[PDB]
Amino acid sequence: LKNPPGPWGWPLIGHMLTLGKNPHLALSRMSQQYGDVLQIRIGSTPVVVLSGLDTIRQALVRQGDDFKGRPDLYTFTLISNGQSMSFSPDSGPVWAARRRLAQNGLKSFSIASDPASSTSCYLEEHVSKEAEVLISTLQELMAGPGHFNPYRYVVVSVTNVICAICFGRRYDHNHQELLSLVNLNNNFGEVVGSGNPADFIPILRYLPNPSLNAFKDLNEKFYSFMQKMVKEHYKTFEKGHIRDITDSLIEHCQEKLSDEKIINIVLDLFGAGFDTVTTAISWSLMYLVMNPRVQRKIQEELDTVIGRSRRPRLSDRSHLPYMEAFILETFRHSSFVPFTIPHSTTRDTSLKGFYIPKGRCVFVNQWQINHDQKLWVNPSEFLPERFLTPDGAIDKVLSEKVIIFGMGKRKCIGETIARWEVFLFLAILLQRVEFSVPLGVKVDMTPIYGLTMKHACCEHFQMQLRS
């Protein structure tokens, strides 16, 4: 048919300099000229970059089986001993079977009803517990220091939820086992983010690379923690009393695809679990602090729809259209997952009249959709009201153009869990407390590129109870 178009690139390094430190911004300007299917080169490796709401739906959904593979990148082979469900090049029926195990394991210990509490489910019970511990920890910080860095304590509250779902345990707010793994050891996004030169320039792996060495250690540390957590569950495993997702995977090793590819699925769940949800909640607090106008509106809605006599529940999610418009605009404006995990073609295929051979690396630019000047009014501006119709309800036609959970056969499997976890944490907190940042302190809202885009650490947040 045709080869996908693209700008001129150096014969040796390709367009690696055009990408720069923000490949999502460069490839969004590039799509304005070369279209929804364009081709670049990182070093000598060709890469196809998909942009556009309809073209990405055409490729990942309607032709999903043509794009459901992962490329064979170097950085991916360092994840979970090279056998990760999400990052391994395996995309046949072996992957499809592991994905179905994860989906069923999640539904059982997140959305399913809790035997302990008749009213709520597992997720609502865990989030309610951790949101109270979080509010108490922040009250203690206002008793002394008078300020705090939220990420340090949100990451614990969010980890205790996904950790209770995967290992049936929780940890205190000041635990060295936990913070070592999750905090200040998470350059996973920085190393795995699409366009990493080390994947396409083979010499950068062997040179002095401080980030790549800390990455090998982070994974080796996590894989050891998994072995400790699974061996301890195997030592007390009772068939019939399934405590968490780990037990249902142990149960599935005895009921019949190696045992390692079954057990290390919790590493993908635990990993994606705390990294994305913590990033999302962290960004939310930044926007509430920089836009006190919209924090006041979220609270005026909570006071009308729920009052202050009872904690918000999952049932209230559909009766709070402004809270959902805020969370949607946090996902759209930040786009803290600017690219999906890189895809790969499983066969010679055709897309919008362009030929893509088998094995071609494929990037999916979610950031471009969420800031397309043709789909949005003031994309650079943070304006939650853009999702509200004239009668104050969520515009469903427009809200389903916020692409951040992926699409197709490789779509996020914890999407529904993240939307409820994010809603509850924000709803329970903003009902009780009000966050702020004093004047005259810098608050760098600039995203830092990575698989999940984080922000500069802010240590000046404050919190007060409400009347």
Ligand X SMILES: C[C@H](CCC(=O)NCCC[N+](C)(C)CCCS(=O)(=O)[O-])[C@H]1CC[C@H]2[C@@H]3[C@H](O)C[C@@H]4C[C@H](O)CC[C@]4(C)[C@H]3C[C@H](O)[C@]12C
Residues near ligand Q4P (CB under 6 A): 79-80, 84, 86, 186, 188, 218-219, 222, 267-268, 271-272, 275-276, 337, 451-452
User: Taking the complex as a whole, how short is the minimal distance between the CB of residue 266 and ligand X, in angstroms?
Assistant: 17
Q: Report which residue type is found at 275.
A: D
User: Taking the complex as a whole, how short is the minimal distance between the CB of residue 251 and ligand Q4P, in angstroms?
Assistant: 22
Q: Report which residue type is found at 408.
A: G
Name the binding residues for substrate. 188
Closest residue by Cα to residue 433 from 340, 248, 233, 299: 299
Q: Is position 2 an interface residue for ligand X (rule: CB under 6 A)?
A: no
User: Taking the complex as a whole, how short is the minimal distance between the CB of residue 107 and ligand Q4P, in angstroms?
Assistant: 19
Q: Which does 78 bind (CB under 5 to 8 A by kind): ligand HEM, ligand Q4P, ligand X, none?
A: none
Q: Is position 86 an interface residue for ligand HEM (rule: CB under 6 A)?
A: yes
Residue that the structure tokens 């944490």 belong to: 425
Q: Is position 230 an interface residue for ligand HEM (rule: CB under 6 A)?
A: no
Binding segment toward ligand HEM, per CB under 6 A, in 169-177, 178-186, 275-283, 426-434: 275-283
**Shorter beta-carbon distance to ligand HEM: residue 141 or 158:** 158
Q: Is position 320 an interface residue for ligand HEM (rule: CB under 6 A)?
A: no
Sign, CA dihedral 46-364-378-292, equals negative
Q: Is position 243 an interface residue for ligand X (rule: CB under 6 A)?
A: no
Interface residue with ligand X, options 2, 29, 62, 239 (CB under 6 A): 239
Number of residues engaging ligand HEM in binding (CB under 6 A) = 24
Neighbours of 126 (CB within 10 A): 24
Name the binding residues. 188, 412
Beta bridge partners of 434: 464
Interface residue with ligand HEM, options 19, 249, 272, 453 (CB under 6 A): 272
Q: Which does 238 bind (CB under 5 to 8 A by kind): ligand Q4P, ligand X, ligand HEM, none?
A: ligand X
C-alpha dist (Å) from residue 120 to 116, 313, 423, 451? 9, 9, 15, 33
3 state DSSP class of 433: strand
Mask for 331-350, x = binds ligand HEM (CB under 6 A): ------x--xx---------
C-alpha dist (Å) from residue 130 to 4, 159, 320, 428? 49, 9, 22, 10
Interface residue with ligand HEM, options 158, 262, 413, 437 (CB under 6 A): 413
Binding segment toward ligand HEM, per CB under 6 A, in 17-25, 144-152, 272-280, 302-310: 272-280
Six-digit token pair at 173?
A: 């707010």
Q: By the 8 A CB rule, do 407 and 416 touch?
A: no
Q: Is position 268 an interface residue for ligand HEM (rule: CB under 6 A)?
A: yes
Closest residue by Cα to residue 339 from 405, 274, 268, 402: 405
C-alpha dist (Å) from residue 300 to 84, 250, 305, 431? 45, 47, 9, 9
Gaps after residue numbers in the chain (C–N over 2.5 angstroms)? 256
User: Taking the complex as a whole, how short is the minimal distance between the CB of residue 167 and ligand X, in angstroms?
Assistant: 17
**Shorter beta-carbon distance to ligand X: residue 234 or 355:** 234
Report the greatest alpha carbon distance in the chain: 68
User: Taking the complex as a whole, how short is the minimal distance between the CB of residue 231 and ligand X, in angstroms?
Assistant: 10
Closest residue by Cα to residue 427 from 316, 334, 331, 329: 316
How far apart are the C-alpha atoms of 188 and 22, rounded to whole Å?
16
Sequence-ordered list of residues with C-beta below 8 angstroms from that of 296, at least 6 positions apart, any chain: none
Binding residues vs ligand X (CB under 6 A): 234-235, 237-239
Binding residues vs ligand HEM (CB under 6 A): 86, 99, 102, 162, 268-269, 272-273, 276-277, 280, 337, 340-341, 404-406, 410-414, 417-418
